[PDB]
Design an enzyme around this catalytic site. Structure first.
Site, PDB file in Angstrom:
ATOM      1  N   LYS A 100       0.807  -1.211   0.000  1.00 14.16           N
ATOM      2  CA  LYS A 100       0.000   0.000   0.000  1.00 14.16           C
ATOM      3  C   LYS A 100       0.840   1.261   0.000  1.00 14.16           C
ATOM      4  CE  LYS A 100      -3.420   1.063   3.120  1.00 14.16           C
ATOM      5  NZ  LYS A 100      -3.917   1.352   4.487  1.00 14.16           N
ATOM      6  N   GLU A 119      -0.965   7.812  13.819  1.00 17.51           N
ATOM      7  CA  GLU A 119      -0.114   6.814  13.193  1.00 17.51           C
ATOM      8  C   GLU A 119       0.962   6.324  14.154  1.00 17.51           C
ATOM      9  OE1 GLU A 119       3.249   7.411  11.793  1.00 17.51           O
ATOM     10  OE2 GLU A 119       3.434   9.190  13.053  1.00 17.51           O
ATOM     11  N   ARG A 120       1.355   5.064  13.984  1.00 14.18           N
ATOM     12  CA  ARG A 120       2.429   4.500  14.788  1.00 14.18           C
ATOM     13  C   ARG A 120       3.754   5.131  14.398  1.00 14.18           C
ATOM     14  NH1 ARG A 120      -0.715   0.652  12.807  1.00 14.18           N
ATOM     15  NH2 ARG A 120      -1.894  -0.710  14.217  1.00 14.18           N
TER      16      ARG A 120
END
Ligand code: ATP
Ligand code: ATP
Ligand code: ADP
Ligand code: MG
Ligand code: MG
Ligand code: MG
Lengths: 53, 491, 442, 477, 466
Positions: free
Chosen positions: E154, E180-181
């Site tokens: 992705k 987000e991580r």
């Protein structure tokens, strides 16, 4: 007769699996509906309990 | 902010009538009167408004008293005078109540004249402790084959009748009440069972129909009917079970045996939830107050069997519970299932399958069990119960057909409570094998014919089985005698 | 001492206002002017000299302004050997009509759990005789057991079997805490203990002390009666060196009484309906039940599972507080099999080959596996095993005997005997004998 | 002095409302009169809501509350290794005081984006199912999620014990220092766990932070952050740490209680709004620093206890969305003799294959593909798939407290995947395995030695492995 | 104006001003704080008091701290030099590469473009990617849902969209990192540096990065998408570009708004989400439009909680979605890149009134042939693979050639694989699939339709097989 029975069994089990998956889909819809309703009901319980203080 | 910080109290407190035994209504609404004053009133004390209405001091608060009104608040205005009477609730008890229909406070509502009893008793009395009781031994006969065989009830037990709407709970209670006519008509005094029916939150027409059904069965001359109907104030529907329980505790404490039916406790819980929410108490699960288990528990714990040193009386409770869509995982069903000594679970699917009474034996239970059975019913019921369990787990052709035979055997029509001897006769005929040759749809016709026969022909056998309580070996041979002969002569 | 006044009485919650001498939390207060003793346990300080309290018996007849005396200490119950054979309620008064409990020592029911350096590692299995329990998830001396179950699966009859066998085969001053259970069952248990010699009303040689806070009591009483039983067992361990048994029945009543106190104690509710303070309060309770270097308290706890869920906050919170939990299921109870122990939900921490041994561990794992997978021969052996897990006249089947019997069924040594010759029997011998008789008749 | 000294106004269920303290900072640790300590969580206009690191029975309305001037901090350093401390760093093992020389805050910010580098090196669990199908790298947050009594603690303890072979050797950059935070556990189970670790000589490199069920909710709340600080000490100094939270469900429960009693608005299941925040800002401090910052790392193995396997409950939802994978444990697989009861269809490791060793990469690629097709199917071709799947799933079982070196695992899985155990029918593999292991441990130390030294199975060692395995298979029962 | 902190409760901070109250949605800056702590006004409580939510940690805040008002909601540096650069909700550089020496600062919390500024004709945004431009075309000023995971590539699809839109059109891109991580953020930063989309040494970077990590308060994670939206709106409204705005997860935007509203004491709604879920999603998504000056096309990765497509968060997000691409792992196991599921990817502009009857009919035919191939596949599972129908195997090979022709070499994957990145125009895609549907390329083998550009490259490869 042996032939003309394995075929009937194969198509019958095809129909059975298809119908079972249709019921699985509909019951999964109802399950998601019910779990959302459960979350809502417990949240409203907690909120109405907090509002009485 | 503050209930008693109204400008009236404050103004004529700064500028300068008994406020110890008398108060004034600060605010009335939805049947909850806040009262300023009444500094001496006790918790749960019954007070008197100016309009003749009564109330119960449920919320003792630092600056006001939350009183619940025993009627219609249209007769209570702000500023009204509230007097003390000094007493907690009490109801008239005694033998003078049998055959009378009273309300939640012991006032006659059948227009037969005032009650002529001589004793009153509190409604919030405590239950007998550990020592005064003794194990439940004597059988309470319901005249219903499924109950008296598979879910036996003893005198001093608290058996729950739980089920969805229109499944047959009131019919079970009413059959149980009608069934005691054979015992109250005799003269053996320690088998007589006086009944009390508590109708909580029902129509007045339903209670009228019920009283007519009891009168047409001659079962009113030993029954009391406490009636807190749907139009009555929530405090009265809340208090009715306790009034009934005290009316039965009179019989219990005086060496007699009473049976009480709470029909039903779901509506009592609803009334208590209304009163508590309107008293601003913090709601809990399903908006029910936190102390509703305490409510049903201190109500139901007063049904006990006293030991011989305390008279030897008893009180048996049959609370009724209505579940919504068979969901016993609810709050009030959970509580009352955990409180009682077993449940008679009635199902809706079983009702329309022709199984009536629609008792689910797989889910029913009685924690007293065979200890509350006569020896004969025990002998037949042990094997019947194990038969049915084996059948249900694999519901091998022998198991299935025998289980279907027994299931057809357990059906029974309404308002026909059978004496225990005939129940034993039927169950014997069905369990030892004499119905394996009949196709199930004729088991009912058999039962009917066979019992016509054994009541016409064999009064001596039924009389000796009633006398001794068990199936004697001679009487065992005579039972096999009769059922073999009849199965031969049957068609 | 310190004298306050009642200012508010709402249900089972009483507010008391102290002029001077404010009592700390958890203290006990006595209400003056009452026939029977009414104790109020402090729960919150609300400022302006006012405390909130939970009553220990019904609060009818209380008046705003009624004097309240301060004990100066938490609820103190009499502890000692003079409590053996008696029945006391949550506050230590006798409720058996035999006179006062003349003991030398009083103990407060609110005490701290043992430390970390006082912890023990010794795990010695206690075999009970039952095939299903001692085979799949056997009990360990010193460890907490737990017996989960819904309404009607057989928890109290199970704790009765355990009382019989264990408490009679023990020399360590057992204690029974009845936490909000039926008065009928409590009276029956008392009268069945008396006639079985475990309680001696004359020339006291009794070895069980009973504590009863029952269903018709307020929530505070049913919440503190387990702590009262704890305090008695803690005396018999701390200052007596004994290895005590503690039968708590039922502990979910303790949890739900906690729920009912939190309801009005003025606190926002958590999930389902229980208190915000469920886990840690049940934890402060359950950590006093442990084996220190001074003595042991092995606890047999019957636990009420509402609606057979096992995911309800109270059972799910208790699960981690026990060493060998055996869950009584309803689905097996409707099979007529008794006890209703769930073989695939009953876990033991001593069921490892370093403690029970090679053979027992292998039998346990093989039986659990053949039950889980339940090849027609496998299903037949599985049904035979399901039957042989039942135990009725009562039975006593020793540990080695049962591992031998379940091996003989597992290996298939008796695949010719019918399925229901193993139902309601003892060891393999009674099974083959019932097969004998039922075969030759039918 | 009503600016650095307040007075308790109310008290109940753990929450001290304190009037005064006009200069206290949010989340500052204050000291009550009776010696207890608290944290200023709420700073309201009229009072301060403090959470007490103790009990309510001892403090009482009117007590005095001093302020320390510093945010909550713990002792960190080497001196903690081997010691069992509580959520504040105080020794509870009776071995004396901690000689720690450095203190460090508990609520620090996780390292940014630039200081990190991708997770490359493996954290060896010594468990075949993990190291083969769900590999974990140094710097990764791998969830260990499952219902009660399914083997989570045992996975953590097997990891902690396995680190001993690296901690005794020579490679300073292959050593791992373990921290085990116990939240809501029994004191008994923590004592027995400490004994388990001391028997296997696994305490000289382990720190045990313990907030048991009899500790105040603030202590159970704080314990994971104290442990994470003790691990960040090693991370920031070129060393490698591994922290286990056992478990985060009970920490979330403690925080829910604390906030509900501080009157903060509840959300789903009465959890506060920032309860997600609560865990993320905790699980984000586990990172792998690039070599410009020391090259250290901190691996997190948080434990989660679901209910009836419901993984989209609120807290499992949060922690699944936070971590880089999960290791699912199942009761049904627990009782089918599959132990460790790792459900591989659900278990995930996104940064897994990049951390795995080259040899284990080779073998576990084939193993994972074969298990995948076997699970997809579960004639004379697909029951070959069935049989291979049965042999492989029988090769994954493993005993407790006995973690294997990586080369032994590769040897076993290599005997499995090349088809050598296609001769042996299922209930035999187990026996063979143990026997086979003994063989390759006793007579074949050179093969394992340079499989460990080279990290891969180069063709000489591949031929050696195949001849060894079939030689042993020929002379095996 | 200058006020004083009067309450600090977790992440909410009540400040009190003496003379001038700041309006709602206004950045206050706390004084003395060693870092830059920014509160955002969310409420006026009366008594000159103002409730705010903090954009960072609130530890060490003292009742009495000085709080200085700004005047504008939050001003982030916007300009052509935020590209190839990371910043947070506040607009400060995260990448430790120095300050952003830009010329103007735009305030977050703008208004959606007026009605008369909306361009009225729906138009396809040509992405140069075969499977997307053919079956599920992206609309200019639309919203797209990436239903992908981790396994399937992705990040490569995102980087290739950035590259294409920058090359085909002249449009720069913005990437918002809502919730987000940090590990995945660093991974993405380095993957976009490697593949040339970000240039650390030149001024040729095609994307600006905005990140709000998971260890940040709900206020940050809730406003970070608006920060990215603002730095994209600058490009659109001041350069006439066709900007591409990515949102790496929109469900975390929803849940951060939920947490924020929970902190402010509001009563939750269905399931627990904020009562303002729809309006909070709308005030953001309504700024991703196609104005008369330019356009912003948004690619928003979507997480479906509990796999319930009727959950309030995905059900309120799907009201704004215009397209949908599904990155199946199943398609990737077949070896197709990009692994876009050609049958589960949808588009609202697929009708013939918008893409013309030619495009519509080519895509409809491809779709029908792929469905019939999966049908004939489950009937071939008979193990009796025969050809009692000529058309059945004819279409089987036609559809295999098609579903391999829906594969394409991406430029960003030119360092890892020798294959050259071939972006193909729209008309060439339509024409090639038209030919393959007309039955022409039968003599060509199958593997000459794999990792190819237009059909010219396909037949060139087919010749070169020998
Ligand atoms: N054993 C029976 N045989 C046939 N019909 C029965 C039997 N029991 C009850 N019924 C009928 O089923 C209907 C419901 O009976 P009943 O009202 O007594 O149950 P219920 O639980 O009280 O329902 P409700 O919710 O109205 O109170 C009645 O028409 C009743 O006559
Ligand atoms: N690989 C294994 N082989 C055999 N037994 C095991 C294995 N792993 C765990 N067990 C056993 O299964 C049981 C589960 O205990 P364990 O603490 O490891 O899991 P848990 O989920 O953490 O339990 P708890 O809910 O109490 O924390 C233990 O008795 C353990 O000995
Ligand atoms: N030996 C037995 N024979 C018959 N029924 C039994 C026997 N032992 C227990 N039971 C049944 O077990 C059931 C459960 O009783 P109880 O122990 O009160 O349940 P629980 O404690 O789980 O609520 C009762 O219905 C009882 O009759
Ligand atoms: Mg009725
Ligand atoms: Mg019980
Ligand atoms: Mg564990």
């Amino acid at each position: 007769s042996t032939t003309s029975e394995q075929s009937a069994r194969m198509t019958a089990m095809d129909n059975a699996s298809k119908n079972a998956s249709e019921m699985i889909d509909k019951l999964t819809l109802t399950f998601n509906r019910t779990r959302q309703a459960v979350i809502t009901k417990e949240l409203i319980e907690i909120i109405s309990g907090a509002a009485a203080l | 902010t503050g209930t008693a910080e109204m400008s009236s109290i404050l103004e004529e407190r700064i500028l300068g009538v008994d406020l110890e035994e008398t108060g004034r209504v600060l605010s009335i609404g939805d049947g909850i009167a806040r009262v300023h004053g009444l500094r001496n009133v006790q918790a749960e004390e019954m007070v008197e408004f100016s309009s003749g209405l009564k109330g119960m001091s449920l919320n003792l608060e630092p600056d006001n008293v939350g009183v619940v009104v025993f009627g219609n608040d249209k007769l209570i205005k702000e500023g009204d005078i509230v007097k003390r009477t000094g007493a907690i609730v009490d109801v008239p008890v005694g033998e003078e109540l049998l055959g009378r229909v009273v309300d939640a406070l012991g006032n006659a509502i059948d227009g037969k004249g005032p009650i002529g009893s001589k004793t009153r008793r509190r409604v919030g009395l405590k239950a007998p402790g550990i020592i005064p009781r003794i194990s439940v031994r004597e059988p309470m006969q319901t005249g219903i084959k499924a109950v008296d065989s598979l879910v036996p009830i003893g005198r001093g037990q608290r058996e729950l009748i739980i089920g969805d709407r229109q499944t047959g709970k009131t019919s079970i209670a009413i059959d149980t009440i009608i069934n005691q006519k054979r015992f109250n008509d005799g003269s053996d005094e320690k088998k007589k069972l006086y009944c009390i029916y508590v109708a909580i939150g029902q129509k007045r027409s339903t209670v009228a129909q019920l009283v007519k059904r009891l009168t047409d069965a001659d079962a009113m001359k030993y029954t009391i009917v406490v009636s807190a109907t749907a139009s009555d104030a929530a405090p009265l529907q809340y208090l009715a079970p306790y009034s009934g329980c005290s009316m039965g505790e009179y019989f219990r404490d005086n060496g007699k045996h009473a049976l009480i039916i709470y029909d039903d406790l779901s509506k009592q819980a609803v009334a208590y939830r209304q009163m508590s929410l309107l008293l601003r108490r913090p709601p809990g699960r399903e908006a029910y107050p936190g102390d509703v288990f305490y409510l049903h528990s201190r109500l139901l714990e007063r049904a006990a069997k006293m030991n011989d040193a305390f008279g030897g009386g008893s009180l048996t409770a049959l609370p009724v519970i209505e579940t919504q869509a068979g969901d016993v995982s609810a709050y009030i069903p959970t509580n009352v299932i955990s409180i009682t000594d077993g449940q008679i679970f009635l199902e809706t699917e079983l009702f329309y399958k022709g199984i009536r009474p629609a008792i689910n034996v797989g889910l029913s239970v009685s924690r007293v069990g065979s200890a509350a059975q006569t020896r004969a019913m025990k002998q037949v019921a042990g094997t019947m119960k194990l038969e049915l369990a084996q059948y249900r787990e694999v519901a091998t052709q022998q198991l299935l057909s025998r289980g279907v035979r027994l299931t057809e055997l357990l059906k029974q029509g309404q308002y026909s409570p059978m004496a225990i001897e005939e129940q034993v006769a039927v169950i014997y005929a069905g369990v030892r094998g004499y119905l394996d040759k009949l196709e199930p749809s004729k088991i009912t016709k058999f039962e009917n014919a066979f019992l016509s026969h054994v009541v016409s022909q064999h009064q001596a056998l039924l009389g000796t089985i009633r006398a001794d309580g068990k199936i004697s070996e001679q009487s065992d041979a005579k039972l096999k005698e009769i059922v073999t002969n009849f199965l031969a002569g049957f068609e | 001492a310190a004298t306050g006044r009642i200012v508010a009485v709402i249900g089972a919650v009483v507010d008391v206002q102290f002029d001077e001498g404010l009592p700390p939390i958890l203290n006990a207060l006595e209400v003056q002017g009452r026939e029977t003793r009414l104790v109020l346990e402090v729960a919150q300080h609300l400022g302006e000299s006012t405390v909130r309290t939970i009553a220990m018996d019904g609060t009818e007849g209380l008046v705003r302004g009624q004097k309240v005396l301060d004990s100066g200490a938490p609820i103190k119950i009499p502890v000692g050997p003079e409590t053996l054979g008696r029945i006391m309620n949550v506050i230590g008064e006798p409720i058996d009509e035999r006179g006062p409990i003349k003991t030398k020592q009083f103990a407060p029911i609110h005490a701290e759990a043992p430390e970390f350096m006082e912890m023990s590692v010794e795990q010695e299995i206690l075999v009970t005789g039952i095939k299903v329990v001692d085979l799949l998830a056997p009990y360990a001396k010193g460890g907490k057991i737990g017996l989960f179950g819904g309404a009607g699966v057989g928890k109290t009859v199970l704790i009765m079997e355990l009382i019989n066998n264990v408490a009679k085969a023990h020399g360590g001053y057992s204690v029974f805490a009845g936490v909000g259970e039926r008065t009928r069952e409590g009276n029956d248990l008392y009268h069945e203990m008396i006639e079985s010699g475990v309680i001696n009303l004359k020339d006291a040689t009794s070895k069980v002390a009973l504590v009863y806070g029952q269903m018709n009591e307020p929530p505070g009483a049913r919440a503190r009666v387990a702590l009262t039983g704890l305090t008695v067992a803690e005396y018999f361990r701390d200052q007596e060196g004994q290895d005590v048994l503690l039968f708590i029945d039922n502990i979910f009543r303790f949890t739900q009484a906690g729920s009912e106190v939190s309801a009005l104690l003025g606190r926002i509710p958590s999930a389902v309906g229980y208190q915000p303070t469920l886990a840690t309060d049940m934890g402060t309770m359950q950590e006093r039940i442990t084996t220190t270097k001074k003595g042991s308290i092995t606890s047999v706890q019957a636990i009420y599972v509402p609606a057979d869920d096992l995911t309800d906050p109270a059972p799910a919170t208790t699960f981690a507080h026990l060493d060998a939990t055996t869950v009584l299921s309803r689905a097996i109870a409707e099979l007529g099999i008794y006890p209703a122990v769930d073989p695939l939900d009953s876990t033991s921490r001593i069921m490892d080959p370093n403690i029970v041994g090679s053979e027992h561990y292998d039998v346990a794992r093989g039986v659990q596996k053949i039950l889980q997978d339940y090849d027609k021969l496998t299903v037949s052996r599985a049904r035979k095993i399901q039957r042989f897990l039942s135990q009725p006249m009562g039975k006593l089947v020793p540990l080695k005997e049962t591992i031998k019997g379940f091996q003989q069924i597992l290996a298939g040594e008796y695949d010719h005997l019918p399925e229901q010759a193993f139902y309601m029997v003892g060891p393999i011998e009674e099974a083959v004998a019932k097969a004998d008789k039922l075969a030759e008749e039918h």
